[PDB]
Design a protein around this ligand. Sequence first.
Ligand SMILES: Cc1cc2nc3c(=O)[nH]c(=O)nc-3n(C[C@H](O)[C@H](O)[C@H](O)CO)c2cc1C
Ligand SMILES: [K+]
Ligand code: NA
Ligand code: NA
Length: 314
Amino acid sequence: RAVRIAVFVPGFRHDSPVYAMLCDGVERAVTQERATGRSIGLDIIEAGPNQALWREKLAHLAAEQRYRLIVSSNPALPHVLEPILRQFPLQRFLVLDAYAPQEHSLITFRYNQWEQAYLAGHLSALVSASAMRFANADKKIGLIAGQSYPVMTQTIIPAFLAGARAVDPAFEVDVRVVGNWYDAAKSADLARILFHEGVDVMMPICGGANQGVLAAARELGFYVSWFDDNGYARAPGYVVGSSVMEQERLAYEQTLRCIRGELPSAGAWTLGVKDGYVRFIEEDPLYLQTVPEPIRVRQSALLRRIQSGELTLP
Ligand SMILES: Cc1cc2nc3c(=O)[nH]c(=O)nc-3n(C[C@H](O)[C@H](O)[C@H](O)CO)c2cc1C
Ligand SMILES: [K+]
Ligand code: NA
Ligand code: NA
């Protein structure tokens, strides 16, 4: 039996870790199963930045009645989908990085981003408190978000702060917002503001604008806590951590289940460190070269406490 899949990207694929990972994993599954001789179609729709059009674009994909599954990502998608689920109940949807319990035609997976961001904040504070080249004597770290949204304000920011405060309760996090997920010039401006306020380690979570923060790091001399995927090679020596979600693998795994007829129609899963889907990347040689022993030792010890449940971050 032939199978057709659509991926709805709420923005652009390139330069957005969550969407690049999503598309890479769906493609990997499709390519794999095509190679067995099976006919599998894959269409990727890049919606672009205009969020006011997302709902109608998704409704048209459902109305086309051709996709066995429409795949998307990000925590706003369940809300976007609400009337579409009602109007087109036979259309199956899969959304990663989201949470929608108790739907009938929508299955979601959320990562434990308290773990993810706590790992990032702890690493950031260790670096900021150290005598590394660009560290200063303040206890100030930064976060530059593309936009504000409930997961960012209720999970990521508080967990980043909590991880930092586990190192020293005096740590502060200065949050800034770009207003979009692409403009690297505008994120660089925020990074310069943070640097001059005394921030020596920043975490960019602003999509294609992340590059602006990397540029500012090289320009001014500060460190970057990278999120979502492996960012060490994007600015060797500046990127001091990668605190990640295993979105490429999850997208691959769930797409395969769809193709083989094993993906449930509904459900809302949460996957974290103990499940293997949130990680701090210690194995990259750039990390080992970039970050001194005492910091790496403490970061490893933290990972062990999360892996055992001793430190549970629900
Ligand atoms: C409405 C909305 C739009 C988003 N757009 C992007 C994006 O274009 N690029 C990106 O890298 N992350 C984007 N994210 C963030 C992403 O889903 C995730 O929360 C962060 O990458 C941290 O894991 C978006 C989040 C929301 C809620
Ligand atoms: K909020
Ligand atoms: Na510091
Ligand atoms: Na210091």
